[PDB]
Design a binder for this molecule. Sequence first.
Ligand SMILES: *Cc1c(COP(=O)(O)O)cnc(C)c1O
Ligand SMILES: *Cc1c(COP(=O)(O)O)cnc(C)c1O
Lengths: 356, 356
Amino acid sequence: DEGDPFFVADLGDIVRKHETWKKCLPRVTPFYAVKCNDDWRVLGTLAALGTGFDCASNTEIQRVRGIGVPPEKIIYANPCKQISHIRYARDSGVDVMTFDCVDELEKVAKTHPKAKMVLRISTLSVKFGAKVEDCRFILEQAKKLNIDVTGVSFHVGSGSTDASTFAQAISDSRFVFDMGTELGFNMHILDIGGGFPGTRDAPLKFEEIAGVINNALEKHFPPDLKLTIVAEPGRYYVASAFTLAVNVIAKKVTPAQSFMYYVNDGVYGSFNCILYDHAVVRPLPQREPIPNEKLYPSSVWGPTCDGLDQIVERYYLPEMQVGEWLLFEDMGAYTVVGTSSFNGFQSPTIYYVVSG
Amino acid sequence: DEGDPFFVADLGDIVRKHETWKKCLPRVTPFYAVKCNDDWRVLGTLAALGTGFDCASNTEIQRVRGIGVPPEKIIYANPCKQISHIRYARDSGVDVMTFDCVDELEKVAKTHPKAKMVLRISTLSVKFGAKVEDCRFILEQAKKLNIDVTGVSFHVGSGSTDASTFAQAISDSRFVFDMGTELGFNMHILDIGGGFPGTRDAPLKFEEIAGVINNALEKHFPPDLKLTIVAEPGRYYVASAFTLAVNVIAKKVTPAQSFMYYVNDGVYGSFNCILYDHAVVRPLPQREPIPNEKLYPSSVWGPTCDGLDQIVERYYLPEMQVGEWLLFEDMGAYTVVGTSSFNGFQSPTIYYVVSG
Ligand SMILES: *Cc1c(COP(=O)(O)O)cnc(C)c1O
Ligand SMILES: *Cc1c(COP(=O)(O)O)cnc(C)c1O
């Protein structure tokens, strides 16, 4: 008994993803954003395909060093680091960090003085990113601190509706790159960040994005042996690789006929993505559709005792039975990584497949 | 170095809270809601003051049995339980569960047939609670299933502005109580739920609520040796016992003068309460106020790489320095229990004091 929830993860989906990356963005070396999903098999698979890693804390630095990815394949791309975490990266070989302001540079001068610093420009956030107005002052201050500033990076953010933002960002990157060189800094890295779609049927497809990037790149950043273009794709690699199966643990009928299904993972667990990632989810019954079937408005609710722990407000389902299974596809990204064990509940075991 | 964040927890605040409970609600035996905060010291202190426990899963049932609380001090107050979790509670001596619908009673008939079932009525939620219109049918179905229905419960929810709700709820509980008796059921438990304030300066104070409850109680549920009144207070006991100190790990100045403070816990961590609990928090500087001090609009931001990980949008603060400490009071409730280690960050160690 105990029909516990579980993920099937398809590591082959990760390989196919990489294959397309390489074909649509051959100038660009991906540093996987480990905060997306840091499952050990997903890390090892990506390590094996020869991906870089984008890590955001000492813990993520340890985990990828744990699988014997050398330091050079890691960018520590967190603009605001605790000073001891910098210390750690300095002790692990990790030397490329980012920053977006001068205060951090002062930290860096005092803690990791030969680090290769990448300057991140706003694009995404009030939280992160230098405005391009402030870069000259920033870069003059960098000079007084004797910082080795070696490139520019931005981060369009995880749901653009127009690809132009990349193109805008890249142009902006050329301007600050140029101030970089003007003031004597050895600028040779362009990091175009994260945000690509990880489900191959999003509205704005990966391929358009790759095309606008490539046109921008050719116009502002002509190939050069001194220049490396890099990115920090997160959901790209993993969104659609993981599928969740959840058991309907409880059932309510309202007499019009509507159903309430209670399942055994929810917004404190894998569906935290509804709260923190703006995710919308589609419940699929794993029983195969039966010809003519009656379908009724349904809510599905997670196991916790909280009224806000709700996964779906009104979705057409066949009449379901306690002990049956709902599938949610595309549950690779920002899903295991945000879970909590609020209320006693424990998160889904992961099972792994290789689509050969 | 590594100015890690940490909680000071004052177990004596728990004892004081218990003393007040007993003085203002002497007819009522509290079953602490362990999902609120299941820290081992908070459980052991409550268990020693002689509290009951409200548990919602097999894990919370284990934890409180782990500290040698016998089964009878446990109510398993989750209306919609996974059938193997029922099985567990049956194997651990836990026999009082609740329910709000007939579907569950079918499960209970099949899994834990001699269980003392408490019927929970809506009050709180679309998610939980039987409408009072449906209780007669519900209770007739219970009888067919041979359920031992032994009482009524409700749950006003965690932030009422008028205490009348309890009074309303209690009246309603008398109605379903009375159908219970009419149909041959041994009704002797009234569980008035959770929702009381846990900071002794909320707008609607504990004491008004205790007064409305007691009036309602004396009017609809006169003292009787056969009747036990019970409750499920969660934040009551712990909200104000815990104080969070967080290190400012990063600083931004905007030239009017405003500041951005980045600290090393945030909404994937102890401030998940902003997202899931409707919490508002007040950042206090731990340096003592200096006479005349200049104060400026400030945001404080959590360590994570997400733009939505923001703690405070505009709060007046003295100018702060990297390496200083912000204190957040009242951070007992729905704070450690929701945390995740999104992005590599690890949650605050807790330190314990006894206000003697
Ligand atoms: C959040 C993040 C990423 C990854 O975002 P995706 O949309 O998953 O590709 C990459 N880089 C930085 C700096 C980020 O914050
Ligand atoms: C959430 C909950 C509680 C405790 O809520 P508080 O506001 O912390 O007192 C008690 N009982 C049930 C059934 C709950 O869902």
